[PDB]
Amino acid sequence: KDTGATHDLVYHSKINTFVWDVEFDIVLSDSKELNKCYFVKCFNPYRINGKCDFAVSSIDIFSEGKRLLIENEFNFKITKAVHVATSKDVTEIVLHLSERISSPFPIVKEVVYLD
Amino acid sequence: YDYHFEVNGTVVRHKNKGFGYMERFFELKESCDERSKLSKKQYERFNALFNFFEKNGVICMAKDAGTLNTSIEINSLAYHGKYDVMKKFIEEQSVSIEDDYKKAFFLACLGRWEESYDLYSNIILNSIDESNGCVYYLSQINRYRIYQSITQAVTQFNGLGLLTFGRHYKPFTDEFLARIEREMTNFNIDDLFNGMPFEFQKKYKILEFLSDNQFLYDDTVKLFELTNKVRSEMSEGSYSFGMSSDIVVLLRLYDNLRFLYENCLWSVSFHEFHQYIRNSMSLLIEKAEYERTRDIDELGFSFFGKKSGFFMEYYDFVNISRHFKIDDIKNLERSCSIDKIRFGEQEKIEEYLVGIAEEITKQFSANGMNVVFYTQFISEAKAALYFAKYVKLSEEGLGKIVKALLFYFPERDLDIGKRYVWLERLTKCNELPKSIISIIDDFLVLQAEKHIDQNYSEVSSNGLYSRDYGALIKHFEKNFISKRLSEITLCLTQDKQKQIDFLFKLLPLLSTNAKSHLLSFKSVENINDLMNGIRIGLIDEFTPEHEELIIEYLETRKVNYIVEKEKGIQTFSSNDYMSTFGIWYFLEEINNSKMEEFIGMDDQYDFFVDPENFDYKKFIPSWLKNYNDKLLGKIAGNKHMKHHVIEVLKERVKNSNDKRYLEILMNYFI
Amino acid sequence: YDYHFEVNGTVVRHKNKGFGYMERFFELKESCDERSKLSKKQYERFNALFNFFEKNGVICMAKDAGTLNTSIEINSLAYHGKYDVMKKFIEEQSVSIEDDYKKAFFLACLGRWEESYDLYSNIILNSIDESNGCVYYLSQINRYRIYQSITQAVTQFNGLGLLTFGRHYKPFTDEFLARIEREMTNFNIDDLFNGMPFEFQKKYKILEFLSDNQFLYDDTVKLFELTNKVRSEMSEGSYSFGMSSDIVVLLRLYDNLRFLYENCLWSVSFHEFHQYIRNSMSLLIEKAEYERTRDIDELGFSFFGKKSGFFMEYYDFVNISRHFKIDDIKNLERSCSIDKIRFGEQEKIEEYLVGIAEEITKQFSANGMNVVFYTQFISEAKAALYFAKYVKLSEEGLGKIVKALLFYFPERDLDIGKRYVWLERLTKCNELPKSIISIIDDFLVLQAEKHIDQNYSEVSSNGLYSRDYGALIKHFEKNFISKRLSEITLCLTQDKQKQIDFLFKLLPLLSTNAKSHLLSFKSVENINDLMNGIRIGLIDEFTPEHEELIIEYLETRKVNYIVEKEKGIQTFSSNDYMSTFGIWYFLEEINNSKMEEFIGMDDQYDFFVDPENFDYKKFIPSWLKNYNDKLLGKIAGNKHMKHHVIEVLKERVKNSNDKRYLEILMNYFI
């Protein structure tokens, strides 16, 4: 690739997920557009479940520093992702680093282990 | 340098070109009648030496050494954290100038650094004419070390502001800050030893190191002979105790603590002394883990009847609580097995934990606190209630810890998610009896009663919320009714909309008349209401009226399937709900038979509902990194998918070396 | 403390508020127009500063820092092991006092400690007129360290004596040892920096650290922190895609080697400095294994596709050889896979290994009596020829590496068992040339010429003997007969008993005419000859004449096993015959059903003879890495064995750090 920032970009191999401090401007299927989104994923394999829970990871969606209350089916199309520490506009890169991961949310901001 | 006084209490000749007097002195101590031949004045000088060497633990010679136990006792109220007895001591009338020396250290340990600066400045005035400079020289060291504490606090108070300390100011007046800067201008601690009287420098040359910038430089380099020269010691084999490099490093830790706490030196609160305790306790646990695993290769797995070689006690508990951060305890928990470290003296570890619970109660069930005491104490109260996983607690002692952890521990340090992580750790060696459930059931009520405000949301950095406390109650007492939560949900209307959404997560805790009226706001009509109804809503059931909407969304996706291929759109960026449905089928919670007639849409769906008719060259091996202990056990249940995914795990543990694919393959698939 | 000077050539300003005088200094470096405003008495004070930092490595500030290209060159003959250049440098004529400081370090490195103490002694007479004192203070340190080096020898030459080198030998005369304890027994190394002028203090304040361990203290603290965060990024599965997180450990390493070898300090021969180097490079290889077996599963890295890897240069081969023991390399070879780390500059690892093979024949062929030099050199020559498995060698360089290994390594260190081990290692990367079989043949005819005594027998500690040199020849030269040993086994009388046992071990290496000459002399009359007879292709199947000799051995064992119960001890042979028997019975090589009556003597015998009724509390997991391909795949077939050597082998995957237990588990059992 080109001369990107790529300095806090780490790859967690335990839950197949990139971690670097970016912000999202996502748009759903037909619901609305949101500003300054970021994800936080938490790896909790020892968890008191229901009779329907199946995942080791759980995702909190954050919208402005406050938690998004999910009310719809969550389609994400990253209209514009932007880097925060270096202010570059990392938009097309996070598109093509996402199909070759084949996980639900490939880029997050932090990953918490065993909660 | 005439003798070695080794850490066992024994004496070895080193360079005594002269008369052997320490060899002779213990010949007087052994005999009872030969010492009744000495002088008059020079016989009470024997009782004073016999008390000194017994109090400091110099026992006998090393050529005539016995088999005697040398246990550690630190007699200090500031080591044990007896904060309320330290405060009763500060409010008593000082007889001596040695009692003001001990008060000035207890003031520093209690965080009130202004009173301690002034009380050391008082002692220096009253102790120049003293004929020994120990109260004078050490008050000049401790006054300068507590000046380094004030200057580094007023930096970090203005680095955080109000978001961390919670007081929105700094606890030092400028009449105190600009005073002590004038009093400490060009105060060189180096010229302190070389500017004291000549009789001080001969008599007390051993106190010279406290004026240095960094001591403990020799003890850190002696940690190299601890953990990683036993690479070569196991070629011939290392053993148990025997004053091995294990015991020498541990007893020199216990001498450096007992020196610095019984002589009330404030250099015991610095980063260089905290890193020394970290670097030397972490490296004694890595050594005992190494010697355990090598003794399972050469000897057998049952030849070591003990759990592990490193046996902790009360003083090892307090040194990890006071000196380690939580990112440093987590390094021990991966680089050892503290389930294999047996903790002794658990009636003393309990009396230390109840006592941290008493101080967290007193600091924050009150309008009175320091921000200087709170910054150093809350790192120890966090590390001690975190490390209490490994301790059996009594029922009346655990109940005082759970009340201080759930109600009185400040949210600036432990949010709602980190309290659950540390409450769940207390239920491993213990469990939840019927008395500790009633504290959580008073926590959910106090969190229910706070969510009636329209501008309140829980802030949690782990992803764990009030949902998860309720899952912990039901994991132990499967039949439980919260009579105060089941009296706030049927005294409930649509006037408060947020508390409707709070108590959606707490449905298996409520009663039948409660679940009657709280299900009066659950409108499941679209499949958008299905998934949060099953994930978040806790429906805990599958009616055919539930599954009928699933078939409809399946069939419309099958209606979308004929335009899935004719339009060329194949991207599902979490547009699925579909890998989720086959997992519900495979777990035997969807009792349809007509599901398998829809198995052509998603590859992950095609695996869970049609195992036998599946093309395993379409398997994405990363799917097993999203499946939990529940679902991975069921894939080792199915006789059709067991032998296939072993070959996809073996091609990922041979080609890469991923320690998660190996952890799956061993704990479930063999 | 006005500017942090990091180990990457950057400068970070901390603890300064006045004029920034290093910022203005690098503005002078980049531009030429800011020069010529310099006074001529100040401009000549610039080319010395500009040459000071281009020699040392302070390139720029932190802000204007671009590339971090930094190579390394330790220009010192002692780092490179040029021994025959040092001998020609001491025989050369003295020129200055700086050329004698660089001289006395070279005699110390050559084990001439009697003459190097005398040479440092002359510098102390002369260096006061030098008006600098740095040659004086560093010679006072270095002479005191040579003194402390000749005290640990005389408490180990006169202490151990017999097992080290022959008998009680004296490298130092009784006059010298008595006299140096007189000239320097009032010396205190703690007051060497204080007993010097105040012009030498505050202009050489960075040299008070050389009196003690506190020149290693800032690097030991940074090892112990950067270890803990590499281990915790490895127990997390995290892969940073930028600069390496232990590039600090590499650059801070090579500063300590370029400080101490260039400035000619004898602190390079410490234990505490040797222990810093191996803990630094164990971390660099444990992370290098972690990073070459990574998996992104994204068709390679897009932006990080041009990432370079850790590879062994020349300076890394020398730092493992001087500073590791063999047990330090044994751990690093079972935790990591050095055979997949690629090694560079193979052309100048030649001259280090040819140079070691030439300095070991220049003192174990002629009168090489310097057992002082033998004390630390032979631990380097052992660790270098052991770690030479991984380098590719030329045939003229391999030949003198092998001829020095077999003939001129002393048997006090490297007996005949671990002399075979370090020969089979050198054949892995180097397929064995024809001029090296001629070196083994000159070694097998020599051991035969030593067996003409009836009192000479081979002593090993591995169980490997002079047979195994002959299977190694018959591994690469399947049709090869000797012409010189066959000229010895043609002359065989009855009075040559130890000769004829020896050549019956080496029977497939002897000629077709002479194999008939010895086998018609003596034949199988023992079970010690049966073990010999199987492996040399003489007994293709067990006849009943041999099995009765086996049970006669097992009975006389059992009668000895009865009387063993009263003495209550357990003593085995060098080669354990009992475990070989059970492997033959388990592989259906012996058809006898009478050996179940012997179960209860040795634990490995009971596993193979009775796989059904064995107590698996006493199964040693080290047994599994002694077995070949066939025996291990037959333990995987026995249903009485398979599901119990999984739980032995699962717990050694997750608890040990050996990589063999995976390869046994995956290739055979899963």
Side-chain angles (χ1 to χ4, degrees), chain C residues 516-522 524 526-527 530-534 536-539 542-544 546-547 549-551 553-587 590 592-593 595 598-609 611 614 616 618-629 631-633 635-638 640-662:
Chain C
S516 299
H517 183 79
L518 73 94
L519 194 277
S520 66
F521 186 84
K522 77 179 184 67
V524 48
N526 195 357
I527 198 162
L530 177 60
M531 292 295 178
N532 192 5
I534 295 297
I536 61 102
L538 186 60
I539 303 166
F542 294 93
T543 198
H546 301 297
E547 296 294 328
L549 295 174
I550 295 170
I551 301 171
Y553 179 76
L554 297 175
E555 181 68 28
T556 55
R557 179 68 177 86
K558 184 67 181 294
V559 176
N560 198 3
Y561 183 75
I562 295 299
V563 74
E564 188 177 0
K565 297 290 180 68
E566 286 85 4
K567 62 178 72 67
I569 63 170
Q570 183 62 255
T571 301
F572 293 101
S573 63
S574 66
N575 45 359
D576 186 74
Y577 291 164
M578 196 71 201
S579 65
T580 309
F581 293 150
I583 296 169
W584 288 344
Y585 177 72
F586 175 68
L587 289 171
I590 298 173
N592 206 168
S593 178
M595 291 184 289
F598 296 99
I599 293 168
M601 289 189 284
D602 291 336
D603 289 331
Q604 189 170 6
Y605 181 75
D606 299 335
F607 173 68
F608 289 106
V609 177
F614 183 69
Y616 285 87
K618 53 181 183 290
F619 183 80
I620 287 170
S622 294
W623 292 346
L624 290 164
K625 57 188 182 180
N626 290 320
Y627 298 160
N628 59 5
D629 192 2
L631 181 63
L632 211 153
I635 297 170
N638 207 164
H640 295 83
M641 286 181 177
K642 191 267 299 295
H643 67 286
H644 289 171
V645 297
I646 288 295
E647 295 293 326
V648 177
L649 200 65
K650 280 175 70 176
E651 70 94 16
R652 290 284 93 197
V653 166
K654 70 180 177 67
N655 290 321
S656 70
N657 284 315
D658 305 342
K659 292 176 71 176
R660 186 70 183 99
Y661 295 116
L662 268 303

Side-chain angles (χ1 to χ4, degrees), chain B residues 286-302:
Chain B
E286 289 179 353
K287 181 182 183 289
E289 183 66 29
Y290 181 75
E291 290 182 353
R292 183 182 71 89
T293 62
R294 295 291 94 190
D295 288 335
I296 296 170
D297 278 332
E298 295 292 327
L299 294 173
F301 183 77
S302 68

